[PDB]
Amino acid sequence: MQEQAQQFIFKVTDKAVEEIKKVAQENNIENPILRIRVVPGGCSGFQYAMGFDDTVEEGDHVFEYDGVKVVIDPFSMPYVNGAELDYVVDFMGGGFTIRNP
Secondary structure, three states, X not given: XOOOOOOOOOEEOHHHHHHHHHHHHOOOOOOOEEEEOOOOOOOOXXXXXXXXXXXXXXXXXXXXXXXXXXXXXXXXXXXXXXXXXXXXXXXXXXXXXXXXX
């Protein structure tokens, strides 16, 4: 089986989405899947990096974006509860920034 209805509360900037759209655009993808995964950073910041996937997890918070698919693990879900992830764009990629109100 059946449809997996689920709307995860999250707010991502336009840059982040643009990063996925661009990343995918550079891959020739029209359906980039943004997955959330906690990554051990450091002084820089404990911000999780993003990536482009195609498959889906056995129950991931699939959140529709600005014309893009996104998902978040069950462990990372509570790590971005209605949180905001501002992805920077620079060099051959960018950075990872997250803000919590």
